[PDB]
Amino acid sequence: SGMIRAIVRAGQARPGPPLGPILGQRGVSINQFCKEFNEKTKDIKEGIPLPTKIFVKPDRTFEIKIGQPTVSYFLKAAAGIEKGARHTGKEVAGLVTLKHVYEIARVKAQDDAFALQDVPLSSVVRSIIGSARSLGIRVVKDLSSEELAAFQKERALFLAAQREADLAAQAEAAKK
């Protein structure tokens, strides 16, 4: 039938949308796919998302190809934040060191993309740096002793003020 891309959680493979109707229209069952995915990713920490490609054949059979997790997840973990920044460039979400970037690149090099592409780690580090720039996470050369926490305190205060301002704007739009 064709190939389907899906970013699925490690062990949280539910038989509902946004993956149920697609596979159902393709013809493949959903419970079989969820079982196979859970048995294939049971060794993975339940919760982290990873892209996978499902090749559905004309005889209603399917094969699964699982790769490395999402770079956004890798960066959020390495920075210690739950959600990225809204206004990229104007605000800073986290702080990741080139060491952490190199480790992320080394763990991610063994995927479909960077396997089909014989490319050294330099370009993968560049891709990770670009992804971090898009997420809004700064990459300092060598700065992590306690100033990471010094910036984390200001970031938490900024997030609190942002939540209060968002609630105030919602209340204003409600009473207007």
Binding site: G16, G20, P21, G24, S29, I30, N31
Partner: protein, 63 residues
């Protein structure tokens, strides 16, 4: 949803739910069924508010 059967929740006003079992069955070939219960109140949209106000005025006669 579970399997070949999706379950979609929504918050629809009661004034807009009249005659919905004849439309849902029409678009689902008689296979779709729905259940609804009163949830909460909210400020009505200006169009239906103007509609019910004009209805009240025409009921009490004078404009």
């Amino acid at each position: 949803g579970v399997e070949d059967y999706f379950t979609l929740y929504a918050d629809v006003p009661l004034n807009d739910m009249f005659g919905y079992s004849t439309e849902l069955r029409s678009c689902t070939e008689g296979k779709g069924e729905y259940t609804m219960e009163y949830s909460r109140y909210q400020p009505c949209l200006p169009s239906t508010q103007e509609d019910v106000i004009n209805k009240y005025l025409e009921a009490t006669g004078q404009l």
